[PDB]
Amino acid sequence: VLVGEQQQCQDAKSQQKEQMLLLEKKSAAYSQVLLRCLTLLQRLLQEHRLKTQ
């Protein structure tokens, strides 16, 4: 019973690292998507609307 208790106790602490890395990498992926959106929107405003139009 206490071996099972210790194993289930240590499982969450060993688990949490990979979700930390997962949220970190998806957080960086969000930054990449936002950078691409910023580039496309500045292309739409400056090149397509501000100067040419």
Partner: protein
């Protein structure tokens, strides 16, 4: 994300289709063209009569 949001809001201006041209300026061009067409129709009628 906020930058993307008001950039999208500024470029769309409430329309699903993109608005590169100034919309009220665009309809000003359209009404100038339509009134010019009406004046041209009257002028061509007068030319035909002459």
């Amino acid at each position: 994300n906020k930058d993307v949001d008001m950039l999208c809001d500024t470029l769309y201006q409430g329309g699903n289709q993109l608005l590169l041209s100034d919309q009220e300026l665009t309809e000003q061009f359209h009404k100038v063209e339509s009134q010019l067409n009406k004046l041209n129709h009257l002028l061509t009628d007068i030319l035909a009569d002459v």
